[PDB]
A paper describes a structure:
To gain insight into the structural basis of DNMT3B-mediated CpA methylation, we also determined the crystal structure of DNMT3B–DNMT3L tetramer covalently bound to a DNA duplex containing two CAG motifs (DNMT3B–CAG complex). The structure of the DNMT3B–CAG complex resembles that of the DNMT3B–CpG complexes with subtle conformational differences: the replacement of the CpG dinucleotide with CpA leads to the loss of the base-specific contacts of N779 with the bases next to the methylation site, as well as a reduced packing between the A6 base and the catalytic loop. On the other hand, K777 forms a side-chain hydrogen bond with the N7 atom of G7, providing an explanation for DNMT3B’s preference for a G at the +1 site in the context of non-CpG DNA. A targeted activity analysis revealed that the preference of DNMT3B for a G at the +1 site is strongly enhanced in non-CpG methylation, but not that of DNMT3A. Strikingly, K777 undergoes significant side-chain conformational changes in response to changes in the major groove environments caused by different +1 bases, providing a mechanism for readout of +1 nucleotides by DNMT3B. This base shape-directed readout of the +1 flanking site by DNMT3B K777 on one hand may reduce the requirement for the N779-CpG contact when the CpG substrate is in a “favorable” flanking sequence context, on the other hand, shifts the preference of DNMT3B toward G at the +1 site on non-CpG substrates.
Mammalian DNA methylation patterns are mainly generated by two de novo DNA methyltransferases, DNMT3A and DNMT3B5. The catalytically inactive DNMT3-like protein (DNMT3L) has an important regulatory role in this process by acting as cofactor of DNMT3A or DNMT3B6–8. In addition to CpG methylation, DNMT3A and DNMT3B introduce non-CpG methylation (mainly CpA) in oocytes, embryonic stem (ES) cells, and neural cells. For simplification, we choose the DNMT3B–CGA complex for structural analysis, unless indicated otherwise. Similar to the DNMT3A–DNMT3L complexes, the DNMT3B–DNMT3L–DNA complex reveals a linear heterotetrameric arrangement of DNMT3L–DNMT3B–DNMT3B–DNMT3L.
Residue numbers in the entry:
A (entry chain C): 178 to 315, 320 to 348, 361 to 379
B (entry chain D), C (entry chain A): 563 to 853
D (entry chain B): 179 to 315, 320 to 351, 360 to 379
Write the structure that this text describes.
DNA sequence: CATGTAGTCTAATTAGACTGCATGG
DNA sequence: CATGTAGTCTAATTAGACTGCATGG
C-alpha cells in the first residue's frame, strides 16, 4: 500500500535510467537539482556486463525506468532484449521485502514490440500495458506500478489506429504523478 | 553451502520440471531411492506426456505450456524443493545453421525458466533447502552462454556423457546442486561401450558414438557416414531399444503411443543422459526422504 | 494313446517348427517349464527371424525356406519329438476376396508341412513318443478343410481364443497331441477382457475385440468401425504393447528391428494366441524333461 | 531290386490313377484276359479315399499316375493330380521289410508348368525324364523303375518342347516306359 | 445381418541427403 | 579438419478406405 507522504518528509528521487536518458526530461519537472550532486541519477546504455553487485553499490533506488529505442533503426539487438534485461535488473534493484520508502518502476515501448513481444512483456511485468497517445492531439505503451499511470482515463484509441500510426509531452505527464511522493524543485 | 539436515526432519521432495520431455528428472529421482511428493511437469508434446504418464502410472502432474503458468500457480502448486529444466536448443545449437539465438524463435523459452525460478525461490527469511538446475548445449554462441549465465547469476559446469555412457554428449549445467564440479565417476551399472548397449547377435564397430540428435543421420558415424552396427554380416543402424540403453533409459521406455523409429529418436535425441543426471541429483538424497 | 514315460526316462524335447513366425511355439514350451533340446525353425521373414533370435538369444536354429528342406536335412537335424506349424492363410481365409485355394498361391505350402511330417515320422517299429500339430483359419472353403484333413488323416478341433484371451480368434487345429478335444479352461494369469490388456490412463470401450488381422482396420470394431479405446476423453486405437497382451505375448516382444506400428501388427496378426497354444502343449510336460 | 527268375514272376497288381491303362497293360502282356477278380483297380476322383480303402484293395505292385493330356476339361488345378498321387502312394507302400518289388510312376503330358514341376521333383525325390514321340519322323516321367532311369532317350531342347506344346493345343510313348517291367512279373500272350 | 491369420489404390506421411560453420585437436 | 539436443526438400514408404461374400445367428 503506497500511501501518500507528507510534503516535509519527501526525500529527493534516486532513479535508474536504462537504454535512454531522462535526466534532461526529469529536470524539467524538478525531480532533481541542476547542481550536479552525484547520486541522483544513474544512466547505463549497455547492460550486458552488469551484475547485481553493481546495482546494489550504486545506492538504493526509488525509480527504475525502462525504454526501447524510438524507431531510430540503431538496433543491434532484438526488441525483446530491452525487456528481458530490464526485468533482470529490477530484481537486482528491488530492496528487502520490508518497504522503508516507496519503490516505483516503469517500462515504456515506442511501438517496437510486436504482439508476440507484448504478451511476453505484460506477463513478466505482471500487468497489461496502458497506451498514452501523443502523436495526434489535433504514442507509447507503458508498464508501471505507479498508481496514477493505471488510474486516469486517457484517450481510448484502437489498435487499427495504432497500426496506421506506425506505418514527449505525453510521456512527461506520466512522470508527474511521482511528484506527490518525492521532493519538488524549482 | 547448505547445512546438513538430519534424517528425521527429511520430507519428500517437491519438484517443478519445466520442459520435462520424457520425464528424465522423475525417472532419475525415483531411481536414486527418493520419495517424490510432487512432480509438476510443463510439457506440450503429446507423445512426451504419454511416456511420462504411462511409464510412471500418473504420479506426474502435467501443467501444459510454460508460458501459461502464472505467479499464483507457482504458489498454489508449490512450495517446490527442486526446479529443473532444459529449454529447446534448436535455436541455440550450432548444428542448426538457421538458429535465431536466445531472444528469438524458441530461445525465448529460457527466460520462462528464469521467470518461474524467481517465482519458485523462497522469500528472504526462509532458510529452507532449495535447489535448481538448467541444462543446455555447449554449441551455442558465446553471447548466448554469457547472457544465460547473467540471468541465472551462475556459471555452467560442462559434463560430457562420454564418461558414463557410450555416446558423446557435451552439455552445460547451470545450477546450485551440491558438488556439481566434482570429478565425474563411472558406476558399475553404466554401459560404457556401444557393444554393451546392443542386442543379441549384433556387433558394434566403435566403442563410442557421436552425439545423438533427433535426426537419423547422427547414427551414421564419421565424415563418411558409416553404419555403426553389423549383424548377420550385413550393416545396420542402431535400434530404439539400443538408443535407450545408450542414453541410460530403461529398455522399452519409449515404446508407447505406437511410436515408430523416427518418433522415438526425436524424444531420445533431445533428452538427458540418465547417468549424467544421476551424477547431478545424487547428493540430493541427503536432504530428502529415502525409500 | 501313447504310453506314459517315467519321470527319469524323460529327455529334453526336439522340435521342428515350420512357418515359425515370431517363435510362438518356442515361447510356449519355455513358459511351460519344458527343457528344449533343439528347435529348428523354418522362416523366411527377416523381421520375424529377428524377433526369435533376439528374444530367445540364439537358442533357435533357423533353416530358411521350407521348400528347400531335403529328406537328408530331416535325418541330420533330427530326430524330432514335436513338429508344429501354421501355414500362410492369405490364400485360404474367406477375408481375402481373391484367395487361390489350397492348390495355388501360398495355400500349397500346406503340403510342405505334410511332406516334411512324413519325413519326420518315426520309422515302422519305433514306438518312441511323437507329436505334431497344424493350425489354420476356420474361414476356409469346405473343399480345402476336407483335403487338409485327408492328407493329415485326422479331423481338426476348433479352439477360439475368446475363452482365454480378449479377442475373437477361431482356428482349426489338426494334430495328435494329448487331450486336444478337452474343454478349454481359463488360467489365473489370463487377461480375459480388453481393459486388462490396456496401459495406464486408458479405458476400453468393449470387453472383447474382433479378430485381429495384419491390417490396421481390424482394430476398428463393429460395422461402424469404432475406435476401441478412450484416452483423455479422445478416441484412440490399440497400442503395440496392448496388441501383445491381447495375444498373450510378453510386453515389448515385437520391439525389434526398429519395427513400427504396422510392422508389429503384421507379425502379431499372423501369430497364434499364446494361451491357446499353452492349452495344447500343456500335456507335453509328462513326456519331456523340465527345468 | 534284384532280378527274379521266370518261374517265380507273379502277375502285376496295378493301381491306375486319373487315367485307365487297362487297355495299355493288357496289350503289352501284363494283365490277364479273363475278367476275374484280380487285376488293376481304377479310380478317377480320390478326394474321398482313405488309407483303409487302399489297403483293403489288396497289396499293390505298381502305382500309376498321370495327368490329363491337354484335355481342356480340368475341373482340378494342375498340381492337384500330383499331391493326390503322393497321398495315396504312401498308403500303397507295404511293410518296411519289402518281400517283393514295388514300383511307381507319374506321367505329365505337358500340363505342369515350371513352378509345379520342381514341386513334383521334391515330393517324388527325383528329377523327371522326358520321353518324346512328336517328331520321330511327349510326356515327362517320374519313376523308380530302374531301366526308365537307366536308359537315356533323345535329348530334347527345352525351348522347343514348350514351343511345340501350345502350338499343338500318351500311349505309344509310355508303352516303352512300361516295357522294362516285364522282367519282374508274368508275361501273358 | 455382422464377420474375417487380405489385396489393391491413393493420399498422407516419413526416411534419408543436403546443408551449415565456429573451433579446438 | 571433424563435429553438431536441426531445418528443408524430395522421394520412398506407409497408412487408410474400399472391397468382398459364405454363413450361422
Ligand atoms: N512452450 C512450451 N511449454 C512447455 N514445454 C515446451 C514448450 N515448448 C517446447 N517444450 C518442450 O520442452 C522440451 C525440451 S527438450 C528437453 C526434454 C527433457 N529435458 C528430457 O530430458 O527429455 C521438448 O520436449 C518440448 O516438447
Ligand atoms: N516358403 C516359406 N518357407 C518358410 N516360411 C514361410 C514360407 N512362406 C511363408 N513363410 C512364413 O510362414 C509364416 C506363416 S504365418 C504363421 C506364423 C507363426 N505361426 C506365428 O505364430 O507367428 C509367415 O510368418 C511367413 O513368413
Ligand atoms: Mg556450479
Ligand atoms: Mg484331434
Amino acid at each position: 500500500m503506497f500511501e501518500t507522504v507528507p510534503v516535509w518528509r519527501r526525500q529527493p528521487v534516486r532513479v535508474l535510467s536504462l537504454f535512454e536518458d531522462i535526466k534532461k526530461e526529469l529536470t524539467s519537472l524538478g525531480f532533481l537539482e541542476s547542481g550536479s550532486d552525484p547520486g541522483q541519477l544513474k544512466h547505463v546504455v549497455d547492460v550486458t556486463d552488469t551484475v547485481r553487485k553493481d546495482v546494489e553499490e550504486w545506492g538504493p533506488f526509488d525509480l527504475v525506468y525502462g525504454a526501447t529505442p524510438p524507431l531510430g533503426h540503431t538496433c543491434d539487438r532484438p526488441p525483446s532484449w530491452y525487456l528481458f534485461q530490464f526485468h533482470r535488473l529490477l530484481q537486482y534493484a528491488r530492496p528487502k521485502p520490508g518497504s522503508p520508502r516507496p519503490f516505483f518502476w516503469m517500462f515504456v515501448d515506442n511501438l517496437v514490440l510486436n504482439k508476440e513481444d507484448l504478451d511476453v512483456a505484460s506477463r513478466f511485468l505482471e500487468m497489461e500495458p496502458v497506451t498514452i497517445p501523443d502523436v495526434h492531439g489535433g504514442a507509447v505503451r507503458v508498464w508501471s506500478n505507479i498508481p496514477a499511470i493505471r488510474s486516469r482515463h486517457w484517450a481510448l484509441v484502437s489498435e487499427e489506429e495504432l497500426s496506421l500510426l506506425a506505418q514527449t509531452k505525453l510521456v512527461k505527464n506520466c512522470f508527474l504523478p511521482l511528484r506527490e511522493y518525492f521532493k519538488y524543485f524549482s | 553451502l547448505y547445512p546438513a539436515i538430519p534424517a528425521a526432519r527429511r520430507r519428500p521432495i517437491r519438484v517443478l520440471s519445466l520442459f520435462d520431455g520424457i520425464a528424465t528428472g522423475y525417472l532419475v529421482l525415483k531411481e536414486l531411492g527418493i520419495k517424490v511428493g510432487k512432480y509438476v511437469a510443463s510439457e506440450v508434446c503429446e507423445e512426451s506426456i504419454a511416456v511420462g504418464t504411462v511409464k510412471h502410472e500418473g504420479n506426474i502432474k502435467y501443467v501444459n505450456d510454460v508460458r501459461n503458468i502464472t505467479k499464483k500457480n507457482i504458489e498454489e502448486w508449490g512450495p517446490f524443493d527442486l526446479v529443473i529444466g532444459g529449454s529447446p536448443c534448436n535455436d541455440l545449437s550450432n548444428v542448426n545453421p538457421a538458429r535465431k539465438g536466445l531472444y528469438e524463435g524458441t530461445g525465448r523459452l529460457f527466460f520462462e525458466f528464469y521467470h518461474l525460478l524467481n517465482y519458485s525461490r523462497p522469500k528472504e527469511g526462509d532458510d529452507r533447502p532449495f535447489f535448481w538446475m538448467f541444462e543446455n548445449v555447449v554449441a551455442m554462441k558465446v553471447g548466448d552462454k554469457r547472457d544465460i549465465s547473467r540471468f541465472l547469476e551462475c556459471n555452467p559446469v560442462m559434463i560430457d556423457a562420454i564418461k558414463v555412457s557410450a555416446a558423446h554428449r557435451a552439455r552445460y549445467f547451470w545450477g546450485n546442486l551440491p558438488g556439481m564440479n566434482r570429478p565425474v565417476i563411472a558406476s558399475k551399472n553404466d554401459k560404457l561401450e556401444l557393444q554393451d548397449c546392443l542386442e543379441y547377435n549384433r556387433i558394434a564397430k566403435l566403442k563410442k558414438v557421436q552425439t545423438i540428435t533427433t535426426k537419423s543421420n547422427s547414427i551414421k558415424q564419421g565424415k563418411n557416414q558409416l553404419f555403426p552396427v553389423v549383424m548377420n554380416g550385413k550393416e545396420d543402424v542402431l535400434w530404439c531399444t539400443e538408443l535407450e540403453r545408450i542414453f541410460g533409459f530403461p529398455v522399452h521406455y519409449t515404446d508407447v503411443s505406437n511410436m515408430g523409429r523416427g518418433a522415438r529418436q526425436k524424444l531420445l535425441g533431445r533428452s538427458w543422459s540418465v547417468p549424467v543426471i544421476r551424477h547431478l541429483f545424487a547428493p540430493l538424497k541427503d536432504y530428502f526422504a529415502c525409500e
